[model samples]
Structure formats: structure tokens, C-alpha cells
Target: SQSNRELVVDFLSYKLSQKGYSWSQFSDSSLDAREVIPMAAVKQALREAGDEFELRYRRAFSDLTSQLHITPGTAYQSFEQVVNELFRDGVNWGAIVAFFSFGGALCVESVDKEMQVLVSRIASWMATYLNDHLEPWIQENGGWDTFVDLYG
Candidate 1:
């Protein structure tokens, strides 16, 4: 579903906006032309998965971030390394949820370090990674429609 793809973009956009990034930077007419998923539904699905997926990954997130010492300079490389490691075993729905949580953790950490600019960059990095790397696997598994059916 294009909606699933949009959900990932929109969710990252929303998260960065919460950290004071401008929404205009994320606007794309190509994406705008597609059918969009409501943010509410996307958020609701994440909330439902939080207990099983997000919480379960919290320790791993903490461990990953603690080791990275993510300065703006190191952020992109760190993100690629961490995410590449996560997907090294292959993509699955649980790993996808962890990817979202990892993006969020980076956003929070960036803001905490007074490097809010990194939030938008992080969001973009995530969108690129998802679209370039993970989208095919996600589609193969029946997309977010299946995700919601299983965990929403």
C-alpha cells in the first residue's frame, strides 16, 4: 500500500514537527498526489504495538544510543550503522517497529543535545532508508494493512 509508505513518511514528519522542525521541508508533491493515511490511524497502530514492540526494544535502543554518542556530525553514519545492523538478520514487522522507535530516540536525543536541526535530518534519513531499503520487504509482507490487522 502506498498508504503504508506514506504512513512511514508522515509519522517521521509528525515526530520531527513535534520537535519544532518545519513541516514545509517535508512536503513533496509526488507524495501529496498519492492517497494518504490518516496520522491518527498510524499513531493508533503504533500505540497498539508499543507494549509488544517498542517496550521490548527499549533496552536495545538504550544500548545502541549509549554507544553512538550521536553528535550531529556522527548522526548519519550512526543511523546507517545501527539500522543496517538491525536489518542484517532480515526485515520483519518487529524490526520495522524498532526502526521507528530508533528514529524517535534519535530525535529526542538530538533535541536534548540542543541540536534540534538534526531532527529533520534524522527524519529524512529514516524516510530514505525506509523507502530505499525496507519498502520492498514491507510490501512483500502485505504492507501496513497486514500490520494493522496483526497488531493494530
Candidate 2:
């Protein structure tokens, strides 16, 4: 399964690159890709990238599976984590709140109370949908592995 393993590595490298990130060392010859990146790091990058995907295509990806587990305040925590990260992303999130928030003159809602829960959930759910649903479909269906030479 050298080819299959190489395929996974290429996918990882491709995904990482798409995010404006890359692991320094990579090799096509080795399936392990130890030269390219530690497997653990690759896995983390994949998960992080998945999180991004979920956040991007949110509403379209909302309900894949029913949730049996609902810990109290879990929603709050998830939204909180997502909102804080969004704020740090340097995209003038104030404007984003206003955009999603609709008319501010009418809303007059504080970012602290209004933006925190909803925005965070938006981030979390989008990440969940992309990673949980779309990505696996893409991987199984076949796509370019960056490790593969175009001529080959």
C-alpha cells in the first residue's frame, strides 16, 4: 500500500499548502513521509484544517448526524472558543458582527452577549460539518496527491 500511503501524504501536503502552511521536508519516495513531517503533526494539521473547513461552509453543512450527547453549556463553550479565535484572525470582526448582526442601530446588541454564543457556534458547526461530512467524501472519491509527479 505504498501508493495509498503516499496518496495520504500528498493530500496532507496539499491541504497544508492550501492553508499557506507547509512542513519543511517532504519526499515522494517514502510513504512514511518522515522527511516531510512527523505523522502526529500531519494529523494535527489535518484536524485543524478540518476545523477551518467546518467554519467556512457552515449552514450548508449543519446536520449530518443526530447528537445523542448534550452537555449543558457545551454550546456556550464552543461558541466562546470559536468567537475568540475569529477575533484574533485580523478580519475586522467588528464589521463581521455588524454584517451578521444585521442593522446595529436596531440591534444595539453587545458583542459580549450577542456575538459570543452565536458566532462561536457558527465556527464550531461549520468546522464540524466540513470535517465530519465533506472531507471524507473527497478523500475516498479520489483526487490528486501532490506527491505524485504530474508526468507519472
Candidate 3:
């Protein structure tokens, strides 16, 4: 079974692989990993939330990219700053989804700029952030099983 931790990792891995990156292998276990919520359901729920974040925060997202001047060197710093700001109010499912969306956006932007290396780096940063900061809150809120019930 996929831990919620692995779910976050696999989810980001799936997203990056969709961009034709080399992380596609990470998604191979998705089916076997499902014990509570199916990966497809999880992906659908989070994808919708990610899209909503982009639509609602379009301007802020744009402004952030420019303001950060993200590069391979500063990617980690930028990720920390932006995500810390997002979680400043508090952590919630919505903010968690936005965090994943933000990481996806960074990856897309990186690939577009031909800095493909940043995609993996950004993915790693997001996974580490989730593990270190968000996992405790998620578990307290009943984990991805509850998330699937609510949002799936």
C-alpha cells in the first residue's frame, strides 16, 4: 500500500512524467500501491484542485515566477519561500493541492525554459516539503483515505 507520503511522491512523479520527462518509472507502481484510495481517484481529485488553483491565482502565479527569478541554483529557496507563504495562513487540503500545483507549474516552466534538470529538483523539493511539513497535518486530518472520501 502506498503511504500518503508515497502518494504525494507518486503523484508528482506522474505529473512530471506526463511532460515526457524520465520520471515515468515512478508511476509504474501506482496500481499495486493502492490499498485505500485508487491512484486514479487521487490523481483526479488533486488535478481538479490544481486546475482551480491556477485559475484563481493566475496573476499571483505569474507574478511569483517573475519575482522569484527561479533558476536551478535558486529553485529550492524559491520553493521554500513560496510554499511557506502558502502555508502561512495554515495547512489544509486546498493548500496542499495548491502546493502540488505550484510544483507542477515550476516544472512546466522549467522544461519550457529548457532547464529540464529543475523538474526533478522541484519534484524532490515538493516531496521533502510534504514529508517534513505537511505530512503531520495530513495524518491528523485522516490521511489520503479521508481525502478520497471528501474529494475523490
The CA lDDT of each predicted structure is 0.68, 0.34, 0.71
Worst 10 residues of 1 by lDDT: 21-30
By TM-score: ranked, best first: 3, 1, 2
lDDT per residue (tens digit) for residues 76-148 in model 3: 6667887798788999888788778777777777767778777667767777788788878877898767777
Model 3 ranges off by over 4 Å:
1-10, 13-40, 75-77
lDDT of 2: 0.34
- Identify the candidate with maximal lDDT: 3
Q: Tens digits of per-residue lDDT for model 1 on 24-124?
A: 43443556556433456656786556446654554776767776667767756667887887778888888888888777767766766678677667776
* TM-scores for the candidates: 0.71, 0.23, 0.74
* Backbone Cα, N, C clashes tallied per candidate: 0, 6, 0
Q: Model 1 segments beyond 4 Å from truth?
A: 1-40, 75-77
Error of 2 at 93 (Å): 26
Residue pairs with colliding backbones in model 2 are 25-36, 54-126, 54-127, 55-126, 55-127, 79-120
